[PDB]
Amino acid sequence: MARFFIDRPVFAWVISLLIVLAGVLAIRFLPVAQYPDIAPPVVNVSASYPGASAKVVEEAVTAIIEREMNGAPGLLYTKATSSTGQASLTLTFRQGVNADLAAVEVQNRLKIVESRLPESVRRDGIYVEKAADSIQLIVTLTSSSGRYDAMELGEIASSNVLQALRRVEGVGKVETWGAEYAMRIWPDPAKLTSMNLSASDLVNAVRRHNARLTVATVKVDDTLVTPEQFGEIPLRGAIRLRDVARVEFGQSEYGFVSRVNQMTATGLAVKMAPGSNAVATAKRIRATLDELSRYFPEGVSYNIPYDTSAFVEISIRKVVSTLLEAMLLVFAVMYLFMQNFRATLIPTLVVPVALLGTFTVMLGLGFSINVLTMFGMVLAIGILVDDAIIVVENVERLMAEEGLSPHDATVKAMRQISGAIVGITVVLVSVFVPMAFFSGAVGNIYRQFAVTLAVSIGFSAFLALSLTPALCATLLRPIDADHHEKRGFFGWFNRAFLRLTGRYRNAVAGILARPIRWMLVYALVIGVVALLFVRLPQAFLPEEDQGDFMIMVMQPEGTPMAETMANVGDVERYLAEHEPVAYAYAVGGFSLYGDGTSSAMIFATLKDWSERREASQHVGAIVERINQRFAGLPNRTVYAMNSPPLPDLGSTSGFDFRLQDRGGVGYEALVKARDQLLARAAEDPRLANVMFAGQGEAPQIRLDIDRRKAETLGVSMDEINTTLAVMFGSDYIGDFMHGSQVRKVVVQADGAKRLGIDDIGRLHVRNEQGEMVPLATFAKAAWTLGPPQLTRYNGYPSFNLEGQAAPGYSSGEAMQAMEQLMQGLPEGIAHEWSGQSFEERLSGAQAPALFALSVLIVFLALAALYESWSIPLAVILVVPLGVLGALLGVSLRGLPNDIYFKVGLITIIGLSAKNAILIIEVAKDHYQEGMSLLQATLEAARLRLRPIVMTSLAFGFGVVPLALSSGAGSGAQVAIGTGVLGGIVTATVLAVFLVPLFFLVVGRLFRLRKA
Amino acid sequence: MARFFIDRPVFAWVISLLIVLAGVLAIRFLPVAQYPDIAPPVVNVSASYPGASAKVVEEAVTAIIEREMNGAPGLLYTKATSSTGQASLTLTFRQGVNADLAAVEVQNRLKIVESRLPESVRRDGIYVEKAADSIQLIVTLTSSSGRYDAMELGEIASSNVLQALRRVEGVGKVETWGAEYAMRIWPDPAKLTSMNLSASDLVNAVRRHNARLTVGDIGNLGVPDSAPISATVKVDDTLVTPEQFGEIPLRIRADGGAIRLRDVARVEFGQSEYGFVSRVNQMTATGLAVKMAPGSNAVATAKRIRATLDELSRYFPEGVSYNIPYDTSAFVEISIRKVVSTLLEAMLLVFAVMYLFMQNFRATLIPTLVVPVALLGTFTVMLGLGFSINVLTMFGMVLAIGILVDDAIIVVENVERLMAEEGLSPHDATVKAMRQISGAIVGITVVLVSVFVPMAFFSGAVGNIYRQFAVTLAVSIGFSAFLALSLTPALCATLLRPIDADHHEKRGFFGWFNRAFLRLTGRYRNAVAGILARPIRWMLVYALVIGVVALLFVRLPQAFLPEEDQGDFMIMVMQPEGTPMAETMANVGDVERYLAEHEPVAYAYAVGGFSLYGDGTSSAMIFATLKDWSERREASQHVGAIVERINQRFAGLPNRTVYAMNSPPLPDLGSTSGFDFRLQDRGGVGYEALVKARDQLLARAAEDPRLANVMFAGQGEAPQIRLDIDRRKAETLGVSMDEINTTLAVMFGSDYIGDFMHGSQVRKVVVQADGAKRLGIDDIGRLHVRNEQGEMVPLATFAKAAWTLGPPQLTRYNGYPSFNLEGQAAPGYSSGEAMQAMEQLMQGLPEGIAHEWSGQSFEERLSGAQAPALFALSVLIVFLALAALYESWSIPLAVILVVPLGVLGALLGVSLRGLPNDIYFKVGLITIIGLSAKNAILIIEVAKDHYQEGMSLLQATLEAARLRLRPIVMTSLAFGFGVVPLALSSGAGSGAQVAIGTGVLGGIVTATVLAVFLVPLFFLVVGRLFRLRKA
């Protein structure tokens, strides 16, 4: 199609302009994130059973819900945890299903068995949510004036900040943590002993008293549901202000302890709406917070102690800068060689248009701009530059070597290269597309953009076959005699390169003269590539310094909120002393529990990477100082999540072993079996570190209820629960503490401070008649060592076991070994692989199959291009040369065989394949002219030397910055750099000295002949 | 293309290899199903109202829910089954509606009307499952020996098998036909009355104790104050043992609450399901039904079910083995396999014919290479379009083979002509021949595709079926055309060697064949000249042929799809309602022993308490899987004869009426093998009047010869206690709440206090009154409803026994009371004829009684309407395409005139073997019309060329026929041989192949014999009448 566009420059210009406009609009509309969503759709079901035993919770809430959920469409697996007071059922759904529809179905299935569940949970209501536990940005309002209560600050936030943030563009939810104003019934612990508490009766009286008219403008506007109104409501001396309530309550609604750098604030979490540019949304939030800060009564200073958007923005900046600098370097190299400003301008114009077309296609398919997208964009710009530069170089050499006018030179050059261009486009497509077939969306994105960037070279089949030929036909002007080659650096460089080309041709002739030796050298290259590939660790994503670290203080099942705050303060002080933390906002609860008193979350934002340049000031080293040194206390399990990777799914050899099947075996029996299995796994060499992730059994106490005696007596079982409520009892609620606002009322013995332990099996219980009779007479409290949380997998109480494969042992091999080690365990116990293990069990041989398919397709396409069944074999043989350099560089650097490295290796393969195809095509053309194989090969090597050198130099120098990255996203950049740079260097040199040898060998072997 | 691919053989080979690889991958990814997916989205809303009769359930649950759902988007039709104690609502939505979204809408409407439903119904829960109503798979846990009893096997299945079966993808509903091992309590109404204790109060106390006890939130979390010990007191009073359930306290007297459950009830950890008795091959085993969700492939789902069962067996307790006694998809798999083998045989036969004619291995080889490439490309296109690997698509490929070879045959023959006559090099000969024949190839392909174009425009499920076949065939033909323009030219340019020096007609049998064909050609030339001598006579003969075609097509009966030997059937053993389960299973065992003794039955699963007609103690069904078709190759051992023998063996048994049916064809469309008829009652004529109309219609069906085995699916009325509760009395007495009435009714039925933790899972707690006491005639009268004030107010105050004959269940089809009248087509009468006979007899029934067809019958009526118009449109399109091809408005008329001969052949073929006008027949008719038109083109084009050259019209026709005898015979013979295995198929899937092959074979046979003697006549007559100009 080149001839058409060469004749119609305005046509090609129009096509390019359309592409550019589409790209601009696509960038305007494209979603932006750090990483694309890869996690399978997951539905979280949460329920709260106030004051319920973990075993009780498992028996009623967990089991029924889990059993009913079985049958939902595409329910890949079900995991359930039964803690005390609450239960969580994570339902992992197979990929391809819409999370929203799955959530609706889950809600309906919950409705099916709503009645069976206990009434208290029914009041609380089962909460179903699509798994989106991504708090991207956090806003906190500290007491700037030092005169604002935590609940007061929270009131200011909810009144103003809450709604405005909800209205802000791209905000999924703005859930809050700040403490509120709820009442807390605070009776003495002798209330039952002196007269009676019977708080159930008076709370029921509270609910009954609060009433509204049922019939129409007439209504009642009288309702007393407040601490002050509790002296006016009948609270059943007895309990009231008029009766004896005395100690009312305190701390309002005690909640998440929010301290921004040891300064009280209000917890206001924010999550980005899925599909919205995080950076731009952050900007919106910032402006809105400025306005609201001006609103604030000069005590509500807004602080951002956490914003993931910053790292996303800086990484995108790094990539975009890399693109711009690469274009600049391409300009530099093309000026160095061509020495014609217009010729320099041509590819500098062509390349961005193809990039914009890639952007358009990306928006069309729905792929979102992410660090993977942009990082691979930097991979294919070199390939983008390569095709434009080879086209324009072929055009200009004809203008120089011959006297063809720009139009004629363009026509002849396109006649020479066009078919090769088509073939190369097809080959690159067939080498990049197979990456999509992987069940990893990482590879899918790294495909889609790279595929449409080789089809940006296909847009170049509408540009480098349409626009670039047109531009060369018009922008290029005939060489000004030899004025382009003066006595300056440019001219000397040109002459020197001519001398170098002569030397190179002589060396290539020498190599061809003794083919056997150099083919043996190539076989040695194969061996070296193999051995380097073997001695290389495997990884999925290189972690980087996000600029923030998360700490969780796990403490014994329940610790006094004062004690938890003490430990939090200790951690915060340690961070403020020996760590470079810009903001160290601390929030109680949260962590794994979500509101657990023992649990505590520390969101600590590091300083700028510039001041933390020292390796000891890297997030890895900073987290290393935490979790030990200061941390590591026996009871105080303070662990810092070391920059949790945004795709929290990468696992090299993690084994999600689940001893799910109970088959009736007691919990004790399952514990025994778990111990035996983990010991044997440790013994077996195929297996590596094996742990029981479940928390070890903690000390506890049980109370065998005197239910039989309560049958004999007037004491009801609910009366026994009420007596517990008197002494060890809470979590009920009230309503309308402040107007329409619904708050809670909680009974607490001896006001706030009960200070009682011997209350266990000691308190008396007045019967239905009212006679004081200790339930301890027949009910007994006994010390125990029960488990903290009960985990059930797929409807079977399970012991989640996490293990890795031993060094050098295959992950699947180790999984088979795990199964065999289990084999022989007591009957009723079985295994069920989950997560990475489950997916691997489903299919793990996709990679070799699609690689072989890609090789076959490439061979067939090359056979079509060369019109022979033998010539492509050389192009196939070219491949390992590029791999050699990537392996060498990654080995010297010490970086692992990460996804970045693999994709860069594929890109290097593509570049070297393009160069080889060009070389061999030109050599074949010369041979078909009549020139002997040797001489034709030498001529092709001479001709296809300068474009290859220019391509390699430009791309390598563009990649060098990434290979020398300094923090702020350094990991991924250096992986990509190292890989691509090594591949480029070795690929280029070995190619220009071996591909002629390959063609010569094939020609001699298969007796290639003229047409 | 032609010259391009000729000059670059490597490129052509590369393209073909790419197509082959794509086909291989597509086959690897293509789904497999017997018939193209035609299942409409269906959602079954099931509810239970224990202690309520069919009338009570109808008026309290089914009516309200049906009214609410009425008006939903899509919702093609609504089927309501108000059984006694259970409500069923099958809502069938229109094809294409998102099943999940429809289910969501149903859930929303259920939410709307939930507040008006009985509270007990809410407690039981309304299960809205997007499932079908046909038991595709059965899983039976057989004990090795008496290690596990029925209850043990049922519990094991529920603990492990049930959840995993529900977990697999594609399953819609897993019915349980075993036991649940749930706490069974048996309160004595006599004892309760003697102690003046209401059963509801007992239920309340049991639920009270069953409820798990709780604690507070002080001493562990928040502010535990001085709690260094965890001291999170773990409630230890939950009751599991039946003794503990007995211990539950009841009304406490002055002496004490000595009255417990044990005093007035029998507590035992027995099974909860007493209404299902399952035996596999006369071996007691628990059973779990599996109904595939609509939209599932139902083969891969079966495979994954088998894999999951394998793993569970790996973890089964010693002595438990899973077994599948009834699988529908196995026939699908084996039939697809057989069709593939038939395709291979057809390829071999076509190769044989082409070698017999060309007599050169390479020239014969080229089309043989062409065939599979086109087939694989068609497979890839099918994958792109979503067409699954179906019997019709595979039929399309099998028919395609012979329609694909011909193009390559023509190309090769032209290349041979030029290479030999003009002494051209294979390259040059190929180039010139391709230059001359490319347009002809493209045109012929276009006409062929045109003939199939309208058949893709059918509507409905038959629309999908015809579309799949037609598109498959058309794509195959298009690929053949492309290959004949790309691959075949290259192969002829390179593979074809120059004609062997002095080719002495390949002396031998080939030489004899050539000489005999030359003599036959002379005789044929003389015959054609004789026909042309007196054109009027032979044209009159052709008009007579048209009349014969019309007569035959009128006589031919119309049907939907031929029945096949599925290899599995179902024996509905019906007993009078109320018949004890024990003797019902005894009769079922009699039937099973008869099966084992005489019939070739591999597996005979027998379940008592389940039937398509209804679920009851009398109801029973035997899912029997036959032995392999190879062992049952004898006609007497085919499924039909077996079913007839079973029916006759247990005929004349009103005490135990036994009816055997074959597995319903197209199970997705309908669950009834015979045509399904709904006798709805639009007008308020009345239930009794509807009964009278039903009986009258059934008598008419019995006397009508065209109808057989026409009966009411629902069981007859049984004498039952018609306990009525006005519930206004409940208002006056102070109860003012049906909840206590509901508790008493479910005490008569099955009351559930709640659930208790058992072993690893949670089992149920049931309180059913003792069997003898429960069946007590005046137990309801003697019992007292607990008043709101606790008063033992006599339940008889608003209880009226009033024993009366009552229907066991009620059916409301499309919001109208209806009676399901299933019927079978009598021998010698097609399904369409049987349905029309049912309609004719329906005329004369009283007003307000409306006839209706559902399932396959509805689709059959829909298919019948649109059949002729699309065929006429096919004829029109073909005529216009030919007119374009010949660049005249006269010449195409002859090619159109050719069609009736092929139609005659198809009609004769089906008439001789008694095959009705089914879907396969119409498909074969379309294909035959196409190929006959192709041959007519082949002859007429040469005739036209000769005429315009200067040869006289008669001379032109004669010479064209002489030159075309060999190609026409070759192509027709290739196609015919390719279709031969279909007509001669025997085994699983034999019926479909026999139908289509018979039609196509007859058509092609006449579309050649009649063609070679009338197409020249047609050309001569047209040339004379329309004065064809020599231009």
Residue numbers in the entry:
A (entry chain C): 1 to 215, 231 to 251, 257 to 1031
B (entry chain A): 1 to 1031
Original authors' sentences:
P. aeruginosa multidrug efflux Y (MexY) is an efflux pump that belongs to the resistance-nodulation-cell division (RND) superfamily. It is a major determinant for resistance to aminoglycosides in this opportunistic pathogen. MexY is also able to confer resistance to a range of other antimicrobial agents, such as fluoroquinolones, macrolides, tetracyclines, spectinomycin, chloramphenicol, and cefepime. This efflux pump is an inner membrane protein that works in conjunction with the MexX periplasmic membrane fusion protein and the OprM outer membrane channel to form the MexXY-OprM tripartite efflux system. It constitutes substrate-binding sites and utilizes the proton motive force (PMF) to export these antimicrobials out of the cell.
To further elucidate the molecular mechanisms of aminoglycoside-specific RND efflux pumps, here, we report the cryo-electron microscopy (cryo-EM) structure of the P. aeruginosa MexY aminoglycoside efflux pump to a resolution of 3.63 Å. The cryo-EM structure of MexY reveals that this multidrug efflux pump forms a homotrimer and adopts the overall fold of hydrophobe-amphiphile efflux (HAE)-RND membrane proteins. Similar to the assembly of many other HAE-RND pumps, the cryo-EM structure of MexY displays an asymmetric, homotrimeric architecture with the pseudo-threefold axis positioned perpendicular to the membrane surface. The conformational states of the three MexY protomers assembled to form this trimer can be assigned as “binding,” “resting,” and “extrusion” states, where the periplasmic cleft established between PC1 and PC2 of the "binding” conformer is open, but the periplasmic clefts in both the "extrusion" and "resting" conformers of this pump are closed. The MexY pump constitutes a large, spacious substrate-binding cavity deep inside the periplasmic cleft. This cavity, compartmentalized into the proximal and distal drug-binding sites, is surrounded with several anionic residues, such as E129, D133, and E175, and aromatic residues, including Y127, Y613, and Y659. Based on the structural information, these anionic and aromatic residues may be critically important for substrate recognition, where MexY may prefer to bind positively charged drugs. Within the “extrusion” protomer of MexY, the cryo-EM structure indicates a similar tunnel, where it vertically connects the opening situated at the ceiling of the central cavity up to the exit site located at the bottom of the funnel region of the MexY trimer. Like the extrusion tunnel of AcrD, this MexY extrusion tunnel is surrounded with charged residues such as D100, E129, K130, D133, R166, E169, K173, and E175. This binding tunnel allows for the interior of the periplasmic domain of the “binding” protomer to be exposed to solvent via the entrance site of the periplasmic cleft created between subdomains PC1 and PC2.
